[PDB]
Design a protein around this ligand. Structure first.
Ligand SMILES: COc1cncc(-c2cc(F)cc(CNC(=O)c3cc(N4CC[C@@](C#N)(C5CC5)C4=O)cc(C)n3)c2)c1
Ligand SMILES: COc1cncc(-c2cc(F)cc(CNC(=O)c3cc(N4CC[C@@](C#N)(C5CC5)C4=O)cc(C)n3)c2)c1
Ligand code: PRO
Ligand code: PRO
Ligand SMILES: [Ca+2]
Ligand SMILES: [Ca+2]
Ligand SMILES: [Ca+2]
Ligand SMILES: [Ca+2]
Ligand SMILES: [Cl-]
Ligand SMILES: [Cl-]
Ligand SMILES: [Cl-]
Ligand SMILES: [Zn+2]
Ligand SMILES: [Zn+2]
Lengths: 484, 488
C-alpha cells in the first residue's frame, strides 16, 4: 500500500480494495469481481437482513432478469428515468431475436404484471416479496468499485397492500433495518431523511433514505432506500381488487419498493479504512482474529509453539469467534502482520516462545494499533470484550466525524463557506426543483445537491423563515452537500 | 383441485401442478419463469445443505460479472464453438449502440479464468476453489420447459484450480457424491452416477461425470448435476501458469474442474413424486412440513368455541415450532377447511394436522400423510414426537418407491433388437458400447426408426462386461456398459 488516504483518495481506494483481495478488475468496465473477502461481508449483511425481513412476513423469490419493452414502458416517469441506461439484448448467437429484450435495471416492471395476476381479492393482500439478485444500470460515466457500478448485487423488496397505512408503516420499518445494517453491522452512522421532489424515485410518491458521510472526500452517499410508490404502478399494471365494503368498486393496491446494494462495502471501506489498509468491523469480518506464531530454537519448542497457537484457535472457535491461525513457514512474522492488517482483521493474536512461557499472549487491535498483553486464562472472554470495543470504537469515531461535519447554515454565504470547507450543511429550503438547480449551479468541485430532508433536523425551523433563495418561504431544513 | 391426469398428458399435468402449487408463474418472455416463494424455498434448502458441504471442502463463495467480452469468450475454441449459438448479446444501452457487443454468461469459465491467471504466480497460490450462486442464460430457440430446460436459470457453479492432477481428480468425485446426496437424501430421488461419453461430455473438458435421474411417467431420463474435469485445456488457453522450484524454469498449467447444479432439481422432484392430487414435497425440503388446519367449523360456529379451537391450533404451532418442525397454522377465517385441505395438498405439504372439537376433547388429533393419504389418530401428547416419526417415514417411503421404479425400468440388453423393444417399453437400457461418436449417432437415428441418447457410463454397471464382447453396432469391440434412453 503506497498511496495515502488524505492525499489521493481514489488511488488509495483502488489500492486498498485490490491489495486486501476484496476486488478484482474485469475487462468490461464498471463490472468488478467480488472475491471471497468482500463477498463474505455481503453474506453477513444478507444473514442479518434476511432474518429481519422474515420476521415482517417477507418471503424470498426469484423473478426473471429480462423485461419486455411493453412492460418496461407502462409507468411513464419510471421508464423515462431509467431508459437511457437499460441494456438491451438483441440477438442470441447471430440470430436476431423477435424483439429486443431488456435487462432489469430494477424489477418493478418485471414483478408487477405477476402481482396483477395474483391479486384477485382483498384476501390476496398483502404481497410481500424480496429477491437477492443482480441488476444492470449501464451508464457511461466513470464507475467506482462498490459505490457506482454498471452491474451490482442487491436485494429489492416489493410489497403491495390494501391500505396506505400498512404500506407507510412498512416503509419506515425497512428504513430502520437499513439504518441497523449501517450502524450496528458496519459501524457507520447515517442520517434518515426523505428525498426532495427533484431527487425522489421516479414513479414513486416519496422516497426515504439513509445518508452516510465520507469525510475523506467531504461527500455524502445514499446507503439504502425505501420508497412509497403509492398507486402509480398499480394503476398502470392493474393490480386491483374489489372494495369489501362497496360492491363493484375497484381499488388499486398501495405499493412500496426498497433496496440495498453492495455499495455498503464501499462505504465501509471509505469510512474506516486507513493508511495501513482495510479496517473491518468485527460484526462483518470474515476473520475476526488471526493467530500468528512469532519468535522462531528447539524442535520441541517449535512444535510446542504451534500446538499453543492451535490451543488458542480451538478455544476461540469454542465461543463462535471466527479465527484463522496463519502457520505458514513461507513468510516472516512481520510480513503476515502487515498482510492481515491490509485485509483489516480486527485482532492479531501473537504467540511467541517467551510469552507462551509466561502463560500469556499479545492481542493487537487493528483500529488503534494498541498492543495488549493478555493472560492465556482470559483468552476467549477478553478477546470477545476487545472485539466489541473495536466495533463501538469504529462507530464512535465515525459519529464524531459526522457530528463535526454536519452543521446548520441559514444564509447562502454561510452555506457556501461551510460547503467549501468539506462539510455537509442543513439549510432552510423551499423545496422547489428550480431553486435546487440554482443551488447546484451557484455553489459550483461539483455543485451541492440535496441529500435528504432529515426526520430529525439539528435545529427547529423558526416561524416565517425564508429559504436560502430568498424568494419563497422555507418549508424544511434540508441537508445539502457534494455527493457520490 | 387438479384436473389433468399424470398418466394421460404429462405436459399439461406438469403445467397445472407447477402453477396450482404456486411454485411457478409464467412471464411474458418465453422460456423465463418466475420462481414464487414455494419453489424458491426448496432451492434455499438445497443451497443450505450444499453450501455447508462445499465449505467443509475449502470452497469459498464469490461473485463474478455477468458479462464477458468477445475476446475472452473465444479463447477456448471447443467451448465457445459449443455455446456460441445460444449466447445472448447486449448491443446497446438505451438507444446508444455499444462500441463492442458484450455477451451474457452461459457459464462463467471464460469470465473467471483470466482472473485466475492473474492470481496464480506460484504453486503456493494454488489451489483456488471458488463457487458462485447466480443466474445464467442459454437462449436456445427450442421449446422451453419450466425447471427442466429454461433460457434463464439459477444455479451454483464451482470452479477450482490445482497444482496437480490427483487433487483435481479427487474433487471431481467428491462434488459428484454431494450432488448424489442432494438428490437421494434431500429430494428422495435415486440417481445413477457415471461418466459422459465422448459425444456428450463438456466441450473442451477432459471428462464429465454425471448423475442421471429417471422420470417413469415420461419413460425419460435427465441429467441432475454435473462435475467436469477440465484438465489443462482451459489453463493453457488462459495462461493459468505457475512455477514450482521442484521443476525449475518450467511454467506448469493448473489442473481445473468446474461443477454445476441448477433449479432443474425442483422439476425432477415434481416429475418423480407428484401425483394426481398435485405436488408431493419430500419432508427434507418442504417449506412447510406440517400444516395445522382448524376443521371444527363454519360461520355458524360459536364465538367462544371458535376461540378455543384457534387457541388449541396455536398450541400445536408452538409445540411443533419448539422442536424445529417447520409448521404453518392456517387460521384464515375467510377460507373453508375443505378449501385449505385442497390448497395444502396441491402444494404437497407432507402432513396435514386436523384439529376438530370432538378430537380436541378426546385429547387427540388427526394426521394425514400426503404421500399415501393415510389418516392416523394421534394422542395430543405424542404431537412433537409422533409427527417427526411420520415425516422421517414419508422421506424413506418416497425414496423407496422411486428406487423400485428405477430398479424396474433400468435393465440390460446385449443386442440392438432387445434394446429397441425394451426402449419402446418406456425403459432405459444398459448396453455394451464401443463409445464412438459415429456409433452413438447411429444408435440415436436407428432407435427413432425421439431416438435414444447415451445418458452415462455407470461407475457401477448392472452386469460385468464379457471379455471380447462386441458393441451393439457389431463393428467394434464394446468398451463399457452404457446407459441409454430417451432424454430431457
Ligand atoms: C449519478 O452520477 C454518477 C456519477 N458517477 C458515476 C455514475 C455511474 C457510473 C457507472 F459506471 C455506472 C452507474 C450505474 N450505477 C448506479 O447508479 C448505482 C446506484 C446505486 N444506488 C443508487 C441509490 C441506491 C441506494 N441506496 C439504490 C438501491 C439502488 C444505490 O445503492 C448503487 C450502485 C452500486 N450503483 C453509475 C453515476
Ligand atoms: C437439448 O435440447 C433441447 C430440447 N428441448 C429444449 C431445449 C431448450 C429450450 C430452451 F428454451 C432453453 C434451453 C437452454 N437451457 C438448458 O439447456 C438447460 C440446461 C440445464 N442443465 C444442462 C446440464 C446441467 C446438469 N446437470 C448443467 C449444470 C448446467 C443442467 O442442469 C439446466 C436448465 C434449467 N436448462 C434448452 C433444449
Ligand atoms: O431502484 C430502486 O431504488 C427501487 C428499490 C429496490 C427496487 N427498486
Ligand atoms: O456449465 C457447466 O456444465 C459447467 C459446470 C458449471 C460451470 N460450467
Ligand atoms: Ca437515469
Ligand atoms: Ca374509484
Ligand atoms: Ca504473566
Ligand atoms: Ca450447444
Ligand atoms: Cl426470441
Ligand atoms: Cl407524482
Ligand atoms: Cl432520525
Ligand atoms: Zn428556495
Ligand atoms: Zn458401436
Amino acid at each position: 500500500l503506497e498511496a495515502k488516504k488524505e492525499e489521493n483518495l481514489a488511488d488509495w481506494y483502488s489500492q486498498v480494495i485490490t491489495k486486501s483481495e476484496m476486488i478484482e478488475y474485469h475487462d468490461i468496465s464498471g463490472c468488478y469481481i467480488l472475491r471471497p473477502w468482500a463477498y463474505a461481508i455481503w453474506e453477513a449483511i444478507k444473514d442479518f437482513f434476511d432474518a429481519e425481513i422474515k420476521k415482517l412476513g417477507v418471503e424470498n423469490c426469484y423473478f426473471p432478469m429480462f423485461v419486455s419493452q411493453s412492460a418496461l414502458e407502462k409507468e411513464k416517469t419510471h421508464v423515462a428515468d431509467f431508459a437511457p441506461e437499460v441494456a438491451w439484448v438483441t440477438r442470441s448467437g447471430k440470430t436476431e431475436l423477435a424483439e429486443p429484450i431488456a435487462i432489469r435495471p430494477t424489477s418493478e416492471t418485471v414483478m408487477y404484471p405477476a402481482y396483477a395476476k395474483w391479486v384477485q381479492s382483498h384476501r390476496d393482500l398483502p404481497i410481500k416479496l424480496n429477491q437477492w439478485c443482480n441488476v444492470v444500470r449501464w451508464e457511461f460515466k466513470h464507475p467506482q468499485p462498490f459505490l457506482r457500478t454498471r452491474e451490482f448485487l442487491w436485494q429489492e423488496g416489493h410489497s403491495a397492500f390494501a391500505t396506505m397505512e400498512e404500506a407507510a408503516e412498512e416503509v419506515l420499518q425497512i428504513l430502520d433495518l437499513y439504518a441497523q445494517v449501517y450502524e450496528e453491522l458496519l459501524a457507520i452512522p447515517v442520517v434518515k431523511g426523505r428525498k426532495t421532489e427533484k431527487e425522489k424515485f421516479a414513479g414513486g410518491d416519496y422516497t426515504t433514505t439513509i445518508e452516510a458521510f465520507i469525510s475523506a472526500s467531504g461527500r455524502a452517499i445514499q446507503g439504502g432506500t425505501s420508497h412509497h410508490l403509492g398507486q402509480n404502478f398499480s394503476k398502470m399494471f392493474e393490480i386491483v381488487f374489489e372494495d369489501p365494503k362497496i360492491p363493484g368498486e375497484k381499488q388499486f393496491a398501495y405499493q412500496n419498493s426498497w433496496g440495498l446494494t453492495t455499495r455498503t462495502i464501499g462505504v465501509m471501506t471509505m469510512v474506516h479504512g486507513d493508511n495501513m489498509g482495510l479496517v473491518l468491523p468485527p460484526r462483518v469480518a470474515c476473520v475476526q482474529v488471526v493467530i500468528i506464531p512469532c519468535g522462531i530454537l528447539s524442535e520441541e519448542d517449535k512444535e510446542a509453539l504451534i500446538a499453543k497457537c492451535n490451543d488458542y484457535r480451538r478455544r476461540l472457535l469454542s465461543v463462535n469467534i471466527r479465527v484463522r491461525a496463519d502457520l505458514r513457514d513461507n513468510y516472516s512474522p512481520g510480513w503476515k502482520f502487515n498482510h492481515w492488517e491490509l485485509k483489516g482483521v480486527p485482532i492479531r493474536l501473537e504467540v511467541g516462545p517467551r510469552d507462551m512461557k509466561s502463560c500469556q499472549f499479545v492481542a493487537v487491535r487493528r483500529d488503534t494499533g494498541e498492543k495488549l498483553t493478555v493472560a492465556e486464562n482470559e483468552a476467549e472472554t477478553k478477546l470477545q470484550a476487545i472485539l466489541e470495543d473495536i466495533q463501538v470504537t469504529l462507530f464512535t469515531r465515525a459519529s464524531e466525524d459526522l457530528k463535526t461535519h454536519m452543521v446548520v447554515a441559514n444564509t447562502m454565504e454561510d452555506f457556501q463557506k461551510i460547503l467549501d470547507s468539506g462539510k455537509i450543511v442543513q439549510i432552510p429550503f423551499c423545496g422547489e426543483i428550480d431553486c435546487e438547480d440554482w443551488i447546484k449551479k451557484t455553489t459550483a468541485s461539483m455543485g451541492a445537491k440535496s441529500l435528504c430532508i432529515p426526520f430529525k433536523p439539528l435545529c427547529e425551523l423558526q416561524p416565517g423563515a425564508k429559504c436560502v433563495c430568498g424568494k419563497n418561504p422555507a418549508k424544511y431544513y434540508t441537508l445539502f452537500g457534494r455527493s457520490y
